[PDB]
Amino acid sequence: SNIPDPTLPPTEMMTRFLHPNWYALPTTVWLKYGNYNSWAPSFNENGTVVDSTTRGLIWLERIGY
Amino acid sequence: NPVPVTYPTDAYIPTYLPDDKVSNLADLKKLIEMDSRLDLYLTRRRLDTSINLPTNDGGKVQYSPNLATLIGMQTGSVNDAVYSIYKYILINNLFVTEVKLDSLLQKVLDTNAAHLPLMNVVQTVNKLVDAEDTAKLREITKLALQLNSSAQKYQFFHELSLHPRETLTHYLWSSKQNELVLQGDQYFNEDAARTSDIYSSLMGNISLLYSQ
Amino acid sequence: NNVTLKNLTAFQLLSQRENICELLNLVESTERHNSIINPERQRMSLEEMKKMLDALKN
Amino acid sequence: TKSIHYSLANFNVFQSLPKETARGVDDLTRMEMALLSGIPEEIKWSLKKYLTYSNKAPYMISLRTLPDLLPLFKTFILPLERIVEGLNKSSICDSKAMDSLQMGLNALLILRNLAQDTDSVQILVKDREIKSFILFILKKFQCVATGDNKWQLYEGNATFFNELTHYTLDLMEAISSYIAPAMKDDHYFQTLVSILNYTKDRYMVISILRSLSRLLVRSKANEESAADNLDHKTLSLIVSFLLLECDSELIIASLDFLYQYILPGSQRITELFKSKECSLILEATLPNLLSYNIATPDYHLLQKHVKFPQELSDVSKVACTFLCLLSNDTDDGAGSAFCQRIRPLVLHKLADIPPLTLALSEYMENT
Amino acid sequence: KPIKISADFNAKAKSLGLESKFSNATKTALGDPDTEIRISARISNR
Amino acid sequence: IEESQAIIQELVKLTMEKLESKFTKLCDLETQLEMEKLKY
Amino acid sequence: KQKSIRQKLINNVASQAHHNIPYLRDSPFTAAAQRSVQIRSKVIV
Amino acid sequence: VGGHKRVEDCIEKFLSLPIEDNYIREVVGSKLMECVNDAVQTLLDKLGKVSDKSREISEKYIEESQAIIQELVKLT
């Protein structure tokens, strides 16, 4: 039946495999407005999952140090 | 369009702290509003306007003896040429508003059509002749998040003082509902998905799949 | 960046437990408070205000 | 195989006679009937499929086509006015509170989706029970924006709160068109003018500027109106967005709002130019906005050794129509002194960009 | 104090149970390109 | 920490008035430049 | 052949994990993400 | 196989054959939060010292917050 024998190198169970717990989630994106702007919005929230200042905390604890 | 970045640019600087225990927070709000007014005056003078060459090496061009009759000069930058030609098309009221070409324009353009768009007119005109601020804005937005963290911990413990019965049952339900989420992806790890131990709801699923 | 449901749900629990286990006085977090108040940033910053305020008078 | 003794499923009277739709209730009636039954874990599916048919086929579940839908959705929307009343303490404490909060946020996003096509928003504005809820959410978000102590956010619930504003604001974009104010002190305008000064995010700033612009049409500027609640603290901000030369969406929204704010009467123009931090911005931005992303002739031959532009951007078109309307104000109002102080700078932009001479016709005929 | 918390994030998680739940994928023993060779050799031998 | 509050209060109170001084002076200079530009 | 059917199960039962698993469906963030996917861009004019 | 059972028994019978386990075996904290989650459960009828302790910790976090703001003023 032309089924590969287990000696061949296709054999591996999971090489690329994503679980919904590992899906990327929509989050607040941060925008840059020049370098002399302090009245600009600097955020863009369209209904993301964190959609608050919690994303800033996540960035603070993991990547901020 | 503004470019998205990979680091938070600003923070909300919360205001649920009691304004009679922590002081000078209004001083911070006044300083931030003043810096918000100290750069609206800079961006304005970055778009500043200047009128320095109405009439006044490749910046100087010698005009032809024909175009020298619509300018009053025989040399000058190309800006003066295109500006003075437009001024001549404007003073003599030649635009059709009821460009209609004049008599001297016939010669300067070498055209007898007596009617030509302005685009072609200026075509014939051409035919005849910074780091440190990013670090400061990341250092400040790296403190308004530490402030936004300590303020959240204060908000939690203060909302725990009032109604502790309501906060503790919420903590115990969040715990019993989050330790379940984290234990939902430990079934697929490539060393327990080929040992036939989890294949003896992964049985009704094959029923739905075969039916599908 | 690159946050996911697991990375977020495991962050909420960490924040809830850091507080609960602190209410029970089981957590010692003095090596975190010795980064805000105890360092000389509480005194040296005041020693910088003590001179900027005087420079702002002339 | 096909035999009576094998199975009794076709004897002589039903083997091709049953209709092609005899397999249960249709996918729409099933949604409508499983929505008023009291069993949970079932509403979480009906409100999932309605949420799907509001982004893949909204013309099928339109409110006008089914005049028994808003009565059902209000049963999930109204309890939010009580849940949102909390959210300053621990209001979610079990698995039945979240079950009634998500079942409400889904019913709110479904209305937010069905409130985008025309001839469907004409049903929300008729029922006061939804406009009152939107006003309530805007009131709470004003309390969050101002900073008063009567209502605090309890940041741990911000996840459930910042997903309600970004839906009610989108419900206001489609509703602000169908209403026109006639009184000075009026909600739906004091809340938006307060939120705009705080929201600090581009999506809300644009949604608010569009809502305010749509709350000033079909009105005359000769009497008290909603346009008198704002002052030189908010107008000194909407015009400041013109200084932001990093995008082509805030500039368009600000120019559109000013064009809608100026349209009626000439006293609006006299009021807009009162301050000395709003005239200095327009005087030094409206000339430069006629050559924004227009590929200037690139005069660079002064350091070396022309290809004049052909079209103009959307921002240049809007700023052109703005100067057109500001041109014909009066012979004494500030609307003419402004266009006169801008002539020696609009002239250079007319000399370097040909196609403006056809669009700036009305501005030139008035000077 | 049986629990000690530091400024970093890994030790903070390690003190609590969540220590190993901040990884995108669980570690493996059969994804090694050597273990699969040995298993394939044993199968070919049988 | 109260000494910090008194010092920050005095420093902010002094800086706001200094900035408003060198802000109105600059606005006056811009007005003079404006009339010197329209005359030209 | 067995490791090519244990791959379709695990790839057709992991994708359907936010609509079947109870403690994963009705949680916060998962519902927020599901709603966020169906936002429907606003009519410009 | 003749056929005396459902069509779906063979699929599971083929998927659940331990044919590679015999050759794989030849080659190859959190206890605190399991008891704290019930110590709080038993703590949950007075709840007086709980609130007093919470207020005592809030008095510390509002102080580290004041220190953070006292530094943000200098940075600004």
What topology emerges from the helices and strands here?
The structure is cut from a larger assembly and holds one copy of chain A (65 residues), one copy of chain B (212 residues), one copy of chain C (58 residues), one copy of chain D (367 residues), two copies of chain E and two copies of chain F.
Chain A: E1 30-31, H1 54-62
Chain C: H1 5-23, E1 27-28, H2 30-33, H3 44-55
Chain D: H1 27-33, H2 43-52, H3 70-77, H4 79-83, H5 97-114, H6 128-146, H7 158-175, H8 190-196, H9 202-214, H10 235-238, H11 250-262, H12 267-272, H13 279-282, H14 314-327, H15 334-341, H16 343-352, H17 356-359, H18 361-365
Helix pairs in contact in D: 2-5, 3-5, 5-7, 6-7, 6-8, 7-9, 8-9, 9-11, 11-14
Subcellular location (chain E): Nucleus
Family (chain E): Belongs to the SNF2/RAD54 helicase family.
Protein name (chain E): Nuclear protein STH1/NPS1
Compute the number of strand runs of chain F.
Answer: 0
The gross shape of chain F turns out to be: rod-shaped
With helices defined by DSSP (H or I, 4 residues minimum), what is the helix count of chain C? 3
Structural class by helix and strand composition of chain F: mainly alpha
| Succession of helices and strands of chain F | H
The share of residues in helices of chain F is: over 70%
Distance between the termini of chain C: 47 Å
Please identify the oligomeric state: part of a larger assembly
Family (chain E): Belongs to the SNF2/RAD54 helicase family.
Subcellular location (chain E): Nucleus
Protein name (chain E): Nuclear protein STH1/NPS1
Protein name (chain A): Chromatin structure-remodeling complex protein RSC58
What would you say this structure looks like, in words?
The structure is cut from a larger assembly and holds one copy of chain A (65 residues), one copy of chain B (212 residues), one copy of chain C (58 residues), one copy of chain D (367 residues), two copies of chain E and two copies of chain F. Chain C has 58 residues and is mainly α. Chain C is built from three helices and one strand, in the order αβαα. The longest helix of chain C is centred in the first third of the chain and has 19 residues. Chain C starts with a helix and ends with a helix. By secondary structure, chain E is mostly helical. The longest helix of chain E has 11 residues. Chain F is mainly α and 40 residues long. Classes of the chains: A little secondary structure (65), B mainly alpha (212), C mainly alpha (58), D mainly alpha (367), E mainly alpha (46), F mainly alpha (40). At the G-H interface, loops of G face helix 1 of H. Strand 1 of chain A pairs antiparallel with strand 1 of chain B. It is classed as dna binding protein. The entry lists the keywords Chromatin remodeler DNA binding Nucleosome binding ATPase Transcription, DNA binding protein.
Quick structural summary:
The structure is cut from a larger assembly and holds one copy of chain A (65 residues), one copy of chain B (212 residues), one copy of chain C (58 residues), one copy of chain D (367 residues), two copies of chain E and two copies of chain F. Chain D is mainly alpha-helical and 367 residues long. Chain D has helices spanning 27-33, 43-52, 70-77, 79-83, 97-114, 128-146, 158-175, 190-196, 202-214, 235-238, 250-262, 267-272, 279-282, 314-327, 334-341, 343-352, 356-359, 361-365.
